[PDB]
Symmetry: C4
Subunit: 219 residues, 4 copies
């Protein structure tokens, strides 16, 4: 009837990958999401995908809050939706990654949320909660724990510069990053420093990944 996330959709008997309506506790109008019903038994709610560089990710605060792109392709679900999902239960984060040779790796975090205790999560800058790494890609996110979300037009980072302008993305930047999955789609090895779709622990600072998917499931 009113699944709160893709795990409710899966447990209701929908086994196919695709677009479904979900209805978080504090977002009762609901919205549509892409559900991954295959990974480790399925029930993952996607909030980010890169796969071909068809969508501009170098967007400002309003676009990162509200979301952009298409559920069937490259997209960012919107921090207001990711907040609505991650505050309603205890969620884990799965990150799938692919290089241009179709090599793959993943990073799993047993704890993930954005603006979890923020009265105004937008004003508070949708700060990241992340813990408990396992996987094959290595950890490129724990160093971002506690950081606010920074865009080219809204600086809340630990740099004297704007990390988002500098590394051409949008992220929970410190000074500045170990990961940059909202970076420019630079298509593999690049001379420029750390300004592509980067996961430093797997492919370092000068390799823009082919594919990323960031997705959540209740623990």
């Amino acid at each position: 009837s009113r699944p709160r996330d893709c795990l409710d959709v899966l447990l209701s008997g929908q086994q196919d990958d695709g677009v479904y309506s979900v209805f978080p506790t504090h977002y009762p109008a609901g919205f549509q999401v892409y559900c991954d019903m295959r990974t480790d038994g399925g029930g993952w709610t996607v909030f980010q995908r890169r796969e071909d560089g068809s969508v501009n990710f170098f967007r400002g605060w309003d676009a990162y809050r509200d979301g952009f792109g298409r559920l069937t392709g490259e997209h960012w679900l919107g921090l207001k939706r990711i907040h609505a999902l991650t505050t309603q239960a205890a969620y884990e984060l799965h990150v799938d990654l692919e290089d241009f040779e179709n090599g793959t790796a993943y990073a799993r975090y047993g704890s993930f949320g954005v603006g979890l205790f923020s009265v105004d999560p937008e004003e508070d800058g949708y700060p990241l909660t992340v813990a408990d790494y396992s996987g094959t890609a290595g950890d490129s996110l724990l160093k971002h724990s506690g950081m606010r979300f920074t865009t080219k037009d809204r600086d809340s980072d630990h740099s004297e510069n704007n990390c988002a302008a500098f590394y051409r993305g949008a992220w929970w930047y410190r000074n500045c990053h170990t990961s940059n999955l909202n970076g420019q789609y630079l298509r593999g090895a690049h001379a420029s420093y750390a300004d592509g779709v980067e996961w430093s622990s797997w492919t370092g600072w000068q390799y823009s990944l082919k594919f990323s998917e960031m997705k959540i499931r209740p623990v």
Copy 2:
């Protein structure tokens, strides 16, 4: 109780043409619509009517998003409402047309939607999905499939010009149109090129129709 569209209203036992409350999945406050309970067994939700040129259709982005006119007369329901309806199920589109001699034709499309997989359908420009033509008016819409919605103040078309300014309407313009049902109410044959209530496949580029109704029903 809470019909999601005019077909739910009809199947609940309301057989009369008129104004009813509907409550789409992701628009739970609901809104009122004109229901056509006669055409091909009935249950059509109207989202556009022209009949007398009493309402200005040469409106900007905000008016096309939010809707204008009156449900009992000339109106545009609003792309935010048409998105809310067409994302909740698989809908067909019916287009009724009339000339100034009370001649009539129709176009049916077995698939229709706006911003179907858009995370932010407004920013994405409420792009048209349309397929599977049958009817008597000929096809004047399939060539618009995949196009974003363009207004005089928001250009997302495939022209070096603004198609909306140029053809004095608001539509899923390419370069520029085969149909222009939101065009100026020019009252039949006109010298100006393709800037009236046009359905090119039926009455060509220099004839502004008397009546149009665009309406949807689940398949």
Copy 3:
């Protein structure tokens, strides 16, 4: 549980005059209103009161849309709330009036609504539907039927002037009025022409009433 108006509140077993929560069809968050449980058997939803000139009624479009004052005193409920109430069923309007000698009269209208078929009732200017007068005050509203709502900062009247600026109120002005219950609280007989709390059919153009209440009940 969820009364849609003061008549639902009365029929649920609440007999006392006062402030209650109501939940109109298309305003499901609900809001509070003053219920008149005495007049002609009770169940009237108040949307306007004048009684002492403590509240400024010479307000702009946003205040008339959103409402102002206090439910227990002088107030205007807001055209967005009056629209939400009058579109959910067929309502009658009761107008109670008092002069400074505690003389009283009433006007009843068997049909009343604002923006009844408007797709965007705000843009359409919350046009008045009113019919079927009876009472003791005489008819000072039927001549306003079909008129849009005009404020000092939003002119939709049939005057070359702004009727709202000119008669220091906010109303469904034609050219200009027979009634002006949102006029200045001028306290009885005044030299200035028709710019007080006027009901012309009862006390003419140069008498600002002590008390007005405008209230609705389903028929």
Copy 4:
């Protein structure tokens, strides 16, 4: 299922202090609050906490309306949420206070609300209802009864000055205050007059408290 406040959460069988979802009558999307399940049997909804001066409370109208800080630390829940809570039932207010020596006192008010009968509580300035004092801190709030909320950028006080600018806080200021719990975190005794976290009846005009919590429970 849908507790309206922390007392519903407690009576549903949740005995632990912490963050819970509540769903007020006229705010059905709901929001999260910190519940005090210990004080005088428990079931208190927190709307204000000071404890360490980590959060700036010298904020404007929008921040006081919308809320700021974190539920687990220093925060202000937002006047739009406090209105939604205090209009749904008859609430009492509990104020806990601590000095820098870990000395403690409390003030209890048997009646508390903000914008209780306001049609537009924001425009009306979220005016305070408070009555019926008991406790150990003395009364520093009854003199504020009937006052609108004043911020540095929105003056509704009884001073020729802006009390909020002058006493570096945000409060239901008269001319100007006996309490200032949204004042600067000045850390105990200060030379400056009445511009810290003040409760004048307990620690006078020149002592900024260590800890304050303002919280409500239905009577």
